[PDB]
């Protein structure tokens, strides 16, 4: 019957088996991958400029990885100069990469929401504001890595860490990292996405406002059912009060059949969700929907509002060419349909939208204003996918230090083994950029 200390030796053998393989794969993929990107991009698109800034910031950390591999399994031999040098590069890569993605989010916001005349703000941001707003504060946050980062002896081996004079310095830089490197860029990316989809959903509303027509009063359908807004069916019921109450329930406000343009858009967005969810469930409409752009989807949703899910599914001959990207060959083959001679003015606007892939078939402004959103949304989500299991480990470990979760030596070493392996796997965001080309 004796009390024993909490041995960290069970964490040492864990790193010596799993981490040498992880740090070897991410090093080779991040040096062959990003190495080719800088040679192809820099020498011999708009988002490609930010990817050049990203592929140079992560490459600087790839040549830093052989030091990370040795420190995790063996000991720190490299010295006090390399200790500061590795800590500075790590600080740069942590805040530069997360703010390059934030600037990518801002670039898509200007290209989609204010596309009318955005060539000047998009240029100024990528050519000048990127250095002032990303590289200048990132190099200004490396000051503590020049003061507190230094080698120290600890029990068995040497450790290269940031040593603060007291706990008040530890907790202020602990909370500073959460803001500048996780919360603040997270707000910028989230607020961009939430106003880009807001614009995208509004563009379909104005598209069908032109085609179907907006009605702020309860009107009778061609079939005789009570309808309001842009073809939003309330009830199949012959009662007006039944549909009137159904409207009051859907809106929340006690309406006497009168609704506003905003209220009409809220009901419209609800009908688009239902149409989209049903389209991706159809075996002949789902492999087409993902292949289309943002405006080509709006034109397909327009056909669903006009004919129905069953009706659009009957274009099996035309939907096949629509996936093969033969937009000039499909439009001439779809112009011969009975649908075109059923309604000629609405059909010509929808078919020219599928043919060109421009929202200018309805808008009286510019031409060929097409922008990509799919590679961006993948890169940002896949970035946080690498960090998500690592930030889970810190969160649980924080409660052990805050004395909320008070358990044994085993649980204390389990969270460490989790953090130690998820840290190594979180550095795959370096390989994430050149792999996205596949």
């Amino acid at each position: 019957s004796m009390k024993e200390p909490c041995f960290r030796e069970e964490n040492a053998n864990f790193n010596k088996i799993f981490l040498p393989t992880i740090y070897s794969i991410i090093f080779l993929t991040g040096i062959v991958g990003n190495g080719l990107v800088i040679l192809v991009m820099g020498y011999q698109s708009m988002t490609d400029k930010y990817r050049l800034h990203l592929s140079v910031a992560d490459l600087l950390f790839v040549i830093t990885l052989p030091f990370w591999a040795v420190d995790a399994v063996a000991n720190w031999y490299f010295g006090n100069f390399l200790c500061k040098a590795v800590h500075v590069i790590y600080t740069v890569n942590l805040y530069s990469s997360v703010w390059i993605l934030a600037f990518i989010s801002l670039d898509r916001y200007l290209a989609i929401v204010h596309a009318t005349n955005s060539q000047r703000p998009r240029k100024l941001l990528a050519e000048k504001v990127v250095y002032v707003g990303v590289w200048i504060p990132a190099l200004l946050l490396t000051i503590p890595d020049f003061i507190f980062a230094n080698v120290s002896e600890a029990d068995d081996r040497y450790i290269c860490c940031r040593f603060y004079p007291n706990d008040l310095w530890v907790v202020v830089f602990q909370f500073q990292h959460i803001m500048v490197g996780l919360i603040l860029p997270g707000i910028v990316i989230l607020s961009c996405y939430c106003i880009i989809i807001s614009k995208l959903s509004h563009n379909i509303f104005e598209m069908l406002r032109i085609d179907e027509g907006l009605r702020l009063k309860i009107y009778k359908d061609t079939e005789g059912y009570y309808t309001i807004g842009i073809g939003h069916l309330l009830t199949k019921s012959p009662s007006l009060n039944a549909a009137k109450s159904e409207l009051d329930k859907a809106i929340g406000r006690n309406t006497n059949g009168v609704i506003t343009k905003d209220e009409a858009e809220k009901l419209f967005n609800q009908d688009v969700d239902a149409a989209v969810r049903g389209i991706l469930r159809n075996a002949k409409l789902k492999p087409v929907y993902d292949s289309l752009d943002a405006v080509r989807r709006a034109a397909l949703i327009n056909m669903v509002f006009q004919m129905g899910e069953t009706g659009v599914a009957g274009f099996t001959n035309s939907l096949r060419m629509l996936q093969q990207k033969r937009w000039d060959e499909a439009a001439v083959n779809l112009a011969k349909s009975r649908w075109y001679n059923q309604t000629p003015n609405r059909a010509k606007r929808v078919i020219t939208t599928f043919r060109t892939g421009t929202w200018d078939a309805y808008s009286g402004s510019g031409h060929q204003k097409r922008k990509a959103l799919k590679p961006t949304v993948i890169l940002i989500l896949a970035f946080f996918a690498c960090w998500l299991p690592y930030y889970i480990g810190i969160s649980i470990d924080s409660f052990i230090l805050l004395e909320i979760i008070k358990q044994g030596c085993e649980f204390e070493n389990t969270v460490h083994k989790w953090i130690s392996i998820t840290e190594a796997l979180a550095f795959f965001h370096c390989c994430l950029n050149p792999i996205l080309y596949a």
């Binding site: 200390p5 960290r8 420190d71 995790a72 790590y90 600890a154 029990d155 230090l401």
Partner: protein, 70 residues
């Protein structure tokens, strides 16, 4: 670097209640400044290591009688 800086040294989460005999103990050494709880780790002749509170009267006596680990 990062993970290796988190918990790299042995710490005491509790202390030995019953006093230990000097004839079984060989050396002693204190816990790292990184540890949440302060104390000493008594190295027995057997090889095994035992935690103890430095404030205890019987522990202060054993530190006098025993040398620091090489």
């Amino acid at each position: 670097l990062g993970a290796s800086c988190h918990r790299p040294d042995k710490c005491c989460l509790g202390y030995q209640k019953r006093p230990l005999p000097q004839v079984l103990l060989s050396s002693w050494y204190p816990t790292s400044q990184l540890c949440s709880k302060p104390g000493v780790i008594f190295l027995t002749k057997r090889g095994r290591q035992v935690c103890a509170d430095k404030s205890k009267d019987w522990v202060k006596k054993l530190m006098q009688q025993l040398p620091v680990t090489a």
